[PDB]
């Protein structure tokens, strides 16, 4: 989904939380 | 102190759903990496292709942004520009991107609203609503769906003519903001596939029959329909005029003791049911006298019994009661009781 | 007794049926119900579903849109009293598009002590004219009962009862309307016709005793309804007493309504013109403004407009942060709004704000704690204010700036002596670096 594809783009470049 | 970006961002991965969007840009960076303060993404709901949120810088591949309260089937612009520092230097004016255009995908439409079942014949119901106020796409067609409703099974079993035969003759921002939490809360039976109409004509019913009608609208007929929720509606036909005539003269018979068996012929096909018949006779010259024949009656004495009564020539007339209404009276039939 | 079951809280209930499962032991909620948006039950999923022990719901009910429930007598066969203490846009019993319901079946049903009823587009629901709501509400002017299948008369309401036009009065076919004598005008009679005592309400299993009712009237204490709770017992909820140690763990366990003491009521939050006392939890006068500290939630809050700082109205120190990003009574109203606060725990962020003219909004503003700093340890963030023009009036105002740094750019309106006396001032003179106060964007 949109949402988990999301959350693991913010791991990924942005780092929050993770 | 104005914008002034002069080289190119460029799209690379555009994703979309229902109510979300998620984008991604090629990566960014000044000759001094410092003066990135972040991105400013613009987006904005554009009909017609004749046309702010932050985002922190990413640490030191493709950054990306997620757009949530996006309606559905809708085109929005958007673009995105850097946000520089005016270094000591020749200032790095940095960079945007052109407007490129971006749709959201369809949901369930919501549920068609206004519908109104009129039963203009006997056979006949004409049904006309409104679109949905939230399309939520492009409406192919609607589905409706009827189904016929059998008649009470208490009133098949109730004595009418006792006591009780009353037969059914078959501040405003409040109220808005009542309505609108309700309608926010909203996020083989015999069907037609309504397409380009707001109304439709139900033919072949029986008459004077109860009909419980569903309403649906829907955006997609072949790949795996998906659809709104129902409306229901109610709705009772006619009743033909003369369907609840009685055939065939009111056959007599006398016993020996002055006993009188009447037969008549039921109304094979009444308005829904007959609740009670009616036997009014009066002989030549006397007032006229009135009895009750509940359904269990006729049922049990296969007519009705007469009995106890002067000697004379008497007249029957038989009228069958629906719930449309009071049948035809039926014509008298003269009869002579044998007096000894 | 009075109560056996446990006390539930309030919940709405929808798609499933789960968690309706949850109200199997309480007798009483302390809250409303919602039943609403099931789709795909069917009637042979409520044919064991049943509540005996429910007896009792405090603020309202609320039925919309279920598919396959047929009637509320077997779910709900002793709900006894409705007490509306907070009601549904003034509904105490709300009943609307439910669909397949055709007969109420509330035949416990005796008060509903505050509110009206709003049953409505429900094609197939009968047994609504043969209903005395003048006996259950005290005002039915404000009832609002339309567009059902009672009103295209085709309805065969039959039941076997004393009636009060004179109609019969019932309230499903089996069941018929409980009409008390004249002289119980509201504490309910037995079976045999004796009026039960004055705190009873509705029903009591033997007349003329106060443990032995089904619903009290006032308050409810150990089996017992009393008129006033005795100390040292405190009213809750309006409906019944509780001691000092349930109030005191109530307010504790939000550490959200955290409840405070206050003339014998354990109530949700102190009146105006009261703070709570953080020894023994009661609410006593204040000299001056009284201190109302106010939370917000993940430490963050945008105000776009004078409608997002309402809530705001108030509040004198802020433990989380401000982000102001209004771009159009303006600057007087939010003084109005605003112009309370003392404190704010996180960072003050203006930032794409073209209608401010001047912070003076800000007017009892004394001290920013920093403790919660924006990426790069900021506590103070200006960004693109196209016409802020004066932060303070330094001659006459007073600031502090605990921890962080400060960051201004593209104020184009704002000399560097504002900012370099808001500098000296706050005492981060030995705080800012390099690329912190943008130089040549701001002042012209």
């Not at chain 2, 996006?70 to 995105?80: D, G, H, M, R």
């Given at each position: 989904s949109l949402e988990e594809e999301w959350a693991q783009i913010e791991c990924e470049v942005y780092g929050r939380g993770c | 102190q104005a914008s002034c970006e002069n080289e190119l961002l460029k799209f690379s991965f555009i994703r979309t759903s229902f109510d979300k969007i998620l984008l991604r840009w090629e990566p960014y960076w000044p000759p001094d990496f410092r003066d990135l303060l972040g991105f400013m993404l613009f987006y904005k709901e554009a009909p017609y292709q004749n046309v702010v949120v932050d985002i922190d810088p990413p640490q030191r591949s493709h950054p990306g942004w997620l757009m949530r309260g996006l309606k559905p089937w809708t085109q929005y612009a958007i673009f995105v520009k850097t946000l520089v520092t005016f270094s000591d230097e020749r200032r790095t004016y940095g960079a945007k991107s052109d407007i490129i255009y971006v749709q959201t995908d369809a949901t369930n439409p919501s549920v068609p609203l206004d519908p109104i079942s009129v039963s203009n014949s006997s056979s006949q119901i004409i049904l006309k609503w409104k679109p949905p106020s939230d399309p939520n796409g492009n409406i192919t067609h609607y589905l409706v769906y009827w189904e016929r409703q059998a008649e009470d099974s208490e009133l098949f079993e109730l004595d009418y003519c006792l006591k009780g035969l009353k037969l059914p003759s078959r501040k405003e921002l409040e109220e808005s903001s009542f309505r609108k939490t309700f309608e926010d809360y909203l996020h083989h039976r015999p069907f037609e596939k309504v397409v380009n109409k707001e109304s439709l004509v139900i033919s072949g019913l029986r008459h004077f029959t109860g009909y419980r009608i569903e309403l649906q609208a829907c955006n997609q007929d072949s790949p795996d329909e998906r659809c709104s929720v129902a409306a229901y509606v109610s709705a009772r036909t006619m009743p033909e005029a003369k369907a609840d005539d009685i055939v065939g003269p009111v056959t007599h018979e006398i016993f020996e003791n002055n006993v009188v068996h009447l037969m008549w012929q039921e109304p094979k096909e009444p308005?829904?049911?007959?609740?009670?018949?009616?036997?009014?006779?009066?002989?030549?010259?006397?007032?006229?006298?009135?009895?009750?024949?509940?359904?269990?009656?006729?049922?049990?004495?296969?007519?009705?019994?007469?009995?106890?009564?002067?000697?004379?020539?008497?007249?029957?007339?038989?009228?069958?009661?629906?719930?449309?209404?009071?049948?035809?009276?039926?014509?008298?039939?003269?009869?002579?009781?044998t007096d000894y």
């Amino acid at each position: 989904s949109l949402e988990e594809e999301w959350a693991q783009i913010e791991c990924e470049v942005y780092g929050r939380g993770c | 102190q104005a914008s002034c970006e002069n080289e190119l961002l460029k799209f690379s991965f555009i994703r979309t759903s229902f109510d979300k969007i998620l984008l991604r840009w090629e990566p960014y960076w000044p000759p001094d990496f410092r003066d990135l303060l972040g991105f400013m993404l613009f987006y904005k709901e554009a009909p017609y292709q004749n046309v702010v949120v932050d985002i922190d810088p990413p640490q030191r591949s493709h950054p990306g942004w997620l757009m949530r309260g996006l309606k559905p089937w809708t085109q929005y612009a958007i673009f995105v520009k850097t946000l520089v520092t005016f270094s000591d230097e020749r200032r790095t004016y940095g960079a945007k991107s052109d407007i490129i255009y971006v749709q959201t995908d369809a949901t369930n439409p919501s549920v068609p609203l206004d519908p109104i079942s009129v039963s203009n014949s006997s056979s006949q119901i004409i049904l006309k609503w409104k679109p949905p106020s939230d399309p939520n796409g492009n409406i192919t067609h609607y589905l409706v769906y009827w189904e016929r409703q059998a008649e009470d099974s208490e009133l098949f079993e109730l004595d009418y003519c006792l006591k009780g035969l009353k037969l059914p003759s078959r501040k405003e921002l409040e109220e808005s903001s009542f309505r609108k939490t309700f309608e926010d809360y909203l996020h083989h039976r015999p069907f037609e596939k309504v397409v380009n109409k707001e109304s439709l004509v139900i033919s072949g019913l029986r008459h004077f029959t109860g009909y419980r009608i569903e309403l649906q609208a829907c955006n997609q007929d072949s790949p795996d329909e998906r659809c709104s929720v129902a409306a229901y509606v109610s709705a009772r036909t006619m009743p033909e005029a003369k369907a609840d005539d009685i055939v065939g003269p009111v056959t007599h018979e006398i016993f020996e003791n002055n006993v009188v068996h009447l037969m008549w012929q039921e109304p094979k096909e009444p308005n829904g049911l007959i609740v009670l018949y009616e036997v009014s006779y009066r002989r030549y010259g006397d007032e006229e006298l009135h009895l009750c024949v509940s359904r269990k009656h006729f049922a049990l004495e296969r007519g009705c019994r007469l009995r106890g009564l002067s000697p004379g020539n008497y007249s029957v007339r038989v009228r069958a009661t629906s719930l449309a209404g009071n049948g035809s009276w039926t014509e008298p039939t003269y009869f002579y009781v044998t007096d000894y």
